[PDB]
Amino acid sequence: MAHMERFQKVYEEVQEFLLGDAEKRFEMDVHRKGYLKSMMDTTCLGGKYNRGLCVVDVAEAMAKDTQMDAAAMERVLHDACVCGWMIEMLQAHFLVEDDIMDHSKTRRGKPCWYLHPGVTAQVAINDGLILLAWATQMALHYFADRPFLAEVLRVFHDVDLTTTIGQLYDVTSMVDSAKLDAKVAHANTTDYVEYTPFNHRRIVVYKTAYYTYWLPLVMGLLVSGTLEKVDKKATHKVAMVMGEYFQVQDDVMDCFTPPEKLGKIGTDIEDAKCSWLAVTFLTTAPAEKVAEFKANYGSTDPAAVAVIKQLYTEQNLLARFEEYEKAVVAEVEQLIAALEAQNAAFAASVKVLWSKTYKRQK
Amino acid sequence: MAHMERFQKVYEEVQEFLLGDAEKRFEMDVHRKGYLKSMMDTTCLGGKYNRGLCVVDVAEAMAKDTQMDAAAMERVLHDACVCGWMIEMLQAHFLVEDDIMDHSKTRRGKPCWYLHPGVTAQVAINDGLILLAWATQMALHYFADRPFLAEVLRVFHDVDLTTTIGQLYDVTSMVDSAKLDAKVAHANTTDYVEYTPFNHRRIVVYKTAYYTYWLPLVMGLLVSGTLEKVDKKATHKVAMVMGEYFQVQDDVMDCFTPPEKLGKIGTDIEDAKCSWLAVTFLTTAPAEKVAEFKANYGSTDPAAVAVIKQLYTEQNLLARFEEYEKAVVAEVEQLIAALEAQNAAFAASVKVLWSKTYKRQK
Numbered sequence: 001m002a003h004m005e006r007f008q009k010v011y012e013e014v015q016e017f018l019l020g021d022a023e024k025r026f027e028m029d030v031h032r033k034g035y036l037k038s039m040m041d042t043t044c045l046g047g048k049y050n051r052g053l054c055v056v057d058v059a060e061a062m063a064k065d066t067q068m069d070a071a072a073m074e075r076v077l078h079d080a081c082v083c084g085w086m087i088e089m090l091q092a093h094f095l096v097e098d099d100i101m102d103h104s105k106t107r108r109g110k111p112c113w114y115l116h117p118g119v120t121a122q123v124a125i126n127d128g129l130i131l132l133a134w135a136t137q138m139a140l141h142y143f144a145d146r147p148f149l150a151e152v153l154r155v156f157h158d159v160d161l162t163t164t165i166g167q168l169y170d171v172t173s174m175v176d177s178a179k180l181d182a183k184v185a186h187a188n189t190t191d192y193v194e195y196t197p198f199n200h201r202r203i204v205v206y207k208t209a210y211y212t213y214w215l216p217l218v219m220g221l222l223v224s225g226t227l228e229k230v231d232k233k234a235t236h237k238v239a240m241v242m243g244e245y246f247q248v249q250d251d252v253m254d255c256f257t258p259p260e261k262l263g264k265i266g267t268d269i270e271d272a273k274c275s276w277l278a279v280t281f282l283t284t285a286p287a288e289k290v291a292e293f294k295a296n297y298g299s300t301d302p303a304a305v306a307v308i309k310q311l312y313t314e315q316n317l318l319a320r321f322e323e324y325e326k327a328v329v330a331e332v333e334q335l336i337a338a339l340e341a342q343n344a345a346f347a348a349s350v351k352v353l354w355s356k357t358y359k360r361q362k
Numbered sequence: 363m364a365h366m367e368r369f370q371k372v373y374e375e376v377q378e379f380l381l382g383d384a385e386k387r388f389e390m391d392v393h394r395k396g397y398l399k400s401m402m403d404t405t406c407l408g409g410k411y412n413r414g415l416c417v418v419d420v421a422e423a424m425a426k427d428t429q430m431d432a433a434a435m436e437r438v439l440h441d442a443c444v445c446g447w448m449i450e451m452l453q454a455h456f457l458v459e460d461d462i463m464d465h466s467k468t469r470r471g472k473p474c475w476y477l478h479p480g481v482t483a484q485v486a487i488n489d490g491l492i493l494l495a496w497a498t499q500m501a502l503h504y505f506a507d508r509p510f511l512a513e514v515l516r517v518f519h520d521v522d523l524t525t526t527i528g529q530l531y532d533v534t535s536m537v538d539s540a541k542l543d544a545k546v547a548h549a550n551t552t553d554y555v556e557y558t559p560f561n562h563r564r565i566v567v568y569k570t571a572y573y574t575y576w577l578p579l580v581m582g583l584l585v586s587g588t589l590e591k592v593d594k595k596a597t598h599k600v601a602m603v604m605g606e607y608f609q610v611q612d613d614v615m616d617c618f619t620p621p622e623k624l625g626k627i628g629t630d631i632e633d634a635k636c637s638w639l640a641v642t643f644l645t646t647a648p649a650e651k652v653a654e655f656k657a658n659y660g661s662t663d664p665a666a667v668a669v670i671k672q673l674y675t676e677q678n679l680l681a682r683f684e685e686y687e688k689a690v691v692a693e694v695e696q697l698i699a700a701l702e703a704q705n706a707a708f709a710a711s712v713k714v715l716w717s718k719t720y721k722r723q724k
């Protein structure tokens with residue numbers, strides 16, 4: 001990828017800064033510095049970098065569009081890389097915490113951070129908090145003299161909030177909402193009445209679309225000083241459409257993509273998650289198959305999980321996804337075409353992001 | 363307390379805003395809104411409000427020392443209350459997450475948030491993240507057009523990082539630092555060689571002093587526009603001394619204050635914490651008593667805990683605290699006197715904070 005080498009160079013730069021700053025400010029000792037280095041490397045590296053690299057792709061596109069000279073271009077690319085790492089560390093934070101919340105086993109082809117024997121969930125929770133803090137530290141340091149610092153902080157923290165609310169929807173989705181009461185436990189649902197297209201859309205847009213699609217695009221515009229050049233509503237709309245689709249893919253892959261290819265072991269079925277598969281099945285399957293689903297879903301029994309997979313297969317869920325995908329392609333293309341009529345350079349950068357999303361395999 | 367009524371009024375305002383903003387932005391439903399209200403009330407209320415009220419005390423002191431109209435004074439006080447609630451919500455965040463990490467039972471006289479039956483650790487982790495996000499939301503909304511927004515965000519997030527690093531020191535203080543390795547599980551220390559005055563100070567300064575003493579003072583100065591009228595270095599120093607002392611008090615009370623008076627059940631002894639009591643004992647007790655301490659410390663067995671408490675009593679640790687406290691008083695009064703010679707208005711607000719700290723019983 002065009003910016004991978006530069007992006008990785010900036011990682012090393014940022015890591016040196018952050019660890020050195022802890023030495024300077026907090027009397028950080030050699031052993032804990034090494035621990036934090038290993039923590040950062042394990043939690044921030046090994047993903048696809050779609051979010052971080054998007055910031056750079058957008059920033060470059062807009063820098064070229066606005067005819068920046070050699071020096072201005074170099075600054076924008078470095079700033080874009082720093083913003084990219086802000087999002088990658090936000091991602092790192094989210095995944096650390098989520099892997100604890102989901103009690104998961106693997107991430108990016110390695111054990112989950114909390115499952116490293118010298119870590120445990122009780123230390124890992126705080127390691128996740130360090131990651132989130134570091135993200136803001138990068139902005140405060142690298143963008144101290146940039147008027148765009150304020151807007152970077154605003155969008156970043158708005159998106160942090162958004163994702164945590166999306167997560168709230170996700171973690172509370174398998175209990176009937178009228179029964180959500182801190183003082184009273186309640187079993188997972190038996191009737192699945194709340195497993196609706198509306199509720200699935202709400203979970204995925206807030207937990208995924210804002211930080212995975214909207215944030216990278218906006219940060220790229222902010223660092224290049226070109227936010228005013230594009231249609232705010234249109235940009236938001238296309239980010240939501242792609243982001244929803246991205247999470248749908250993730251949902252489909254939970255069941256149908258081998259864990260060794262995916263790099264993680266999802267447990268959506270045994271955890272009774274309101275996934276795209278569950279919602280699409282429940283709303284389209286004949287009554288006797290819905291009965292079978294309800295009798296098997298949300299069970300850790302490997303055979304019960306297999307029953308659900310079989311039900312999904314026999315209900316042609318993959319074909320139904322293919323049809324959903326065709327509708328998404330059409331809408332995304334319409335939205336990009338409209339963006340292109342306003343600013344072609346930005347529209348092309350959305351196309352780049354879309355191309356890395358459409359029909360991805362992991 | 364002079365500003366308690368105003369401070370509580372602002373809580374209700376801020377809560378209405380935050381919950382209303384979730385309805386507007388995230389399609390928040392009535393049930394989860396209710397959940398979030400109960401979460402906010404349980405995690406943010408019921409404490410002493412020393413941090414939040416400090417912001418208002420400082421801001422008022424400094425605003426009175428400037429000549430400003432009734433409208434301007436009202437604005438400073440309201441902004442101060444919002445800043446105070448930022449810190450109280452940061453506190454709320456820290457305690458939610460720490461109670462999970464320490465696997466604790468009670469907080470402010472009620473079950474810990476994660477221990478509420480309808481919550482659990484796997485939901486509460488995210489509830490803590492929402493709290494942290496909300497703190498920044500308050501600044502972004504209430505201070506959208508204030509000159510101090512940028513500096514408020516900078517200090518708040520610097521202190522957030524600081525505290526997470528302090529927490530790192532805390533959670534890893536029971537294992538020999540050379541053995542800290544993510545890949546390898548290691549037993550807690552058996553020799554306690556790193557339970558030193560330096561290492562205790564390092565834990566308490568970063569995990570407590572910055573957010574409990576430094577941050578409230580600085581926020582009060584920022585919202586009143588008076589940060590440049592005070593000695594930065596001297597303000598930092600007095601905050602560190604008082605904060606260290608505050609945490610030492612907390613450590614002492616873990617062992618010696620009834621949990622019903624304290625409002626929480628500490629497990630420092632059971633969890634082999636590098637507390638002030640442990641360090642003071644290990645550095646002052648005769649060799650055979652040190653040996654007996656090592657044999658009994660870090661054990662959940664009631665008899666072993668009882669042995670430690672008796673050893674502490676026999677080593678006169680309470681009396682040793684009183685001597686430490688006398689030394690702290692002497693230093694603080696000297697530092698305050700120096701501050702008073704420079705800015706008497708600010709020095710008075712430091713005295714208010716110190717008076718709530720010195721010889722507190724919970």
Ligand SMILES: CCCCc1ccc[n+](CC(P(=O)(O)O)P(=O)(O)O)c1
Binds near residue numbers: 094102163164208
């Ligand atoms: C505030 C925490 C956000 C956590 C978050 C948001 C979106 C996706 N994930 C991780 C995925 P996965 O674990 O990567 O499959 P999910 O568990 O399916 O949602 C985590």
Ligand SMILES: CCCCc1ccc[n+](CC(P(=O)(O)O)P(=O)(O)O)c1
Binds near residue numbers: 129526569
């Ligand atoms: C980043 C998490 C900070 C957690 C944090 C910082 C300072 C004090 N506490 C709580 C106290 P306590 O639980 O109130 O006694 P500690 O466990 O003694 O340290 C928690």
Ligand SMILES: C=C(C)CCOP(=O)(O)OP(=O)(O)O
Binds near residue numbers: 050
């Ligand atoms: C599905 C979501 C939103 C979490 C994982 O995101 P990615 O699939 O982008 O993970 P990495 O490339 O960062 O590993």
Ligand SMILES: C=C(C)CCOP(=O)(O)OP(=O)(O)O
Binds near residue numbers: 412570
């Ligand atoms: C010891 C620390 C730093 C955690 C508890 O702080 P407080 O004793 O100030 O708790 P509340 O008043 O907020 O309950």
Ligand SMILES: [Ca+2]
Binds near residue numbers: 099104
């Ligand atoms: Ca997960």
Ligand SMILES: [Ca+2]
Binds near residue numbers: 098101102
């Ligand atoms: Ca999850």
Ligand SMILES: [Ca+2]
Binds near residue numbers: 254266
């Ligand atoms: Ca998933």
Ligand SMILES: [Ca+2]
Binds near residue numbers: 464
């Ligand atoms: Ca603790």
Ligand SMILES: [Ca+2]
Binds near residue numbers: 460461464466
């Ligand atoms: Ca604790």
Ligand SMILES: [Ca+2]
Binds near residue numbers: 612613
């Ligand atoms: Ca304590």
